[PDB]
């Protein structure tokens, strides 16, 4: 689409992997005037907003918060607190015909002011003065929708550039749209720190014979202690037991007599740490 009829593509319930888009390196620019280019793939939003419009290479800087332009101040403005991001790439590959591609449109003559996020379909003729138009294409009345020509072998400032806006708006609804939560390999029979979706802690991940409910995932005990959970990847019961710990008691005689000691790792089989169990 163009700047005059920029549409909105709002999609909910996404896992938005922006890491592959940041690692693509195929677009012209990726620096967005919002949050930092990193850490955005771990923060969770309610839904993503997408737009579509094209601007020439001479006005690719007019899609930044706090900018002026004859093309941007009447077709698509930026919010005062824009926190999302804007991606643009060189569109002079498949959308630029010879003699001037007049498919896309644009509008530069408007008497009223434009507000951020305001898509208008104003097609009526505009008056550049005080005399009324009364339906004429003569003096003091110009048609706002002019021909957005695309010269295929012109300067960079005239080449087409497909621009998309990805606003990261937050509402009162719970956050749903966020990216990848990567996992690791499975560790068995070792005191390791687990990073499950619901629980985070340390323990030994072993197998057991108890079977959970088809909808139940986690599991507690009598005195509110976790005993076993279900692996999110493969449906299986993993017994979570606290790894071996205890207290060291040094049994030593009088230091005036000798200087030898004998440690005692309490309540441990001491296969995990003169041996006499």
């Amino acid at each position, epitope marked *: 689409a163009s700047v005059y009829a920029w549409n909105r593509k709002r999609i909910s319930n996404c896992v938005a992997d922006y890491s592959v888009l940041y690692n693509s390196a195929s677009f012209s620019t990726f620096k967005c005037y919002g949050v930092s280019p990193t850490k955005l793939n771990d923060l969770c939003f309610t839904n993503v907003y997408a737009d579509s419009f094209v601007i020439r290479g001479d006005e690719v800087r007019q899609i930044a918060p706090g900018q002026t332009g004859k093309i941007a101040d009447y077709n698509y403005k930026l919010p005062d607190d824009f926190t999302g991001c804007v991606i643009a790439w060189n569109s002079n590959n498949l959308d630029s015909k010879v003699g001037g591609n007049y498919n896309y449109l644009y509008r530069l003559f408007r008497k009223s002011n434009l507000k951020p996020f305001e898509r208008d379909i104003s097609t009526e003729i505009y008056q550049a003065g005080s005399t009324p138009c009364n339906g004429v294409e003569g003096f003091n009345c110009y048609f706002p929708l002019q021909s957005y020509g695309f010269q295929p*072998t012109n300067g960079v400032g005239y080449q087409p550039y497909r621009v998309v806006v990805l606003s990261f708006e937050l509402l009162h609804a719970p956050a749903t749209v966020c990216g990848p939560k990567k996992s690791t390999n499975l560790v068995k029979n070792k005191c390791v720190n687990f990073n499950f979706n619901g629980l985070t802690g340390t323990g030994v991940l072993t197998e057991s014979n108890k079977k959970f409910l088809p909808f139940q995932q986690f599991g507690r005990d009598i005195a509110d202690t976790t005993d076993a959970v279900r692996d999110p990847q493969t449906l299986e019961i993993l017994d979570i037991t606290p790894c071996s710990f205890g207290g060291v008691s040094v049994i030593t005689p009088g230091t005036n007599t000798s200087n030898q000691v004998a440690v005692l790792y309490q309540d441990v089989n001491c296969t995990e740490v003169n041996v006499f169990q």
Partner: antibody
Amino acid sequence: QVTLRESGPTLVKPKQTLTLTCTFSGFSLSTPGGGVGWIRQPPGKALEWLALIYWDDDKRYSPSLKSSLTITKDTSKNQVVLTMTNMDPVDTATYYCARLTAADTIFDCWGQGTLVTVSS
Amino acid sequence: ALTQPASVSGSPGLSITISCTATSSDVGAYNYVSWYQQHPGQAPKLMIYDVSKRPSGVSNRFSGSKSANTASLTISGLQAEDEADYYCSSYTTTSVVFGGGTKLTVLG
């Protein structure tokens, strides 16, 4: 994917209507950038572009024979007809059906070459 | 007007330069240049599609780039082979011109 088939009558009369049907398959005139066109080239001479049918039904013509150059398309039959009206005696050349796949790739696909002579 | 010399032939295995003219304001920026290679009796083959990058169909030692305002396809490795007619092509402000042609032969 490259099934360019150049057809049309070779021996035509002076000041007649030339018909060049270029049948193809695979790529069609739906994706932007893809554009079929004809290139005029006399035997042993250089090349020159005459018509270029684009995906948006744009009939781009050349100023050399702007008054007499006309070309249509058919997305269903996958056949593009070049209607060169008022065939002059000097218009004897070898037409070549090509396909502008993109703006940078200038006429990737090329046909075989059909010689068209004009006389009485 | 992509005017090209008639026939600039040279010794086999030499990087002979093929040139066509400046292609002034009638041609906007000279950013879409595609050299051709038309064998006698067959269809022309595309040796390059962009200023520097060549297509994937006839990927060979056919290299070339535009320095200031003219393009030159320099062939050094795969030169001792068949010969044909070269054609530099580009778009103008409103039309598409092919210019003349360079019937480069293999002298010797």
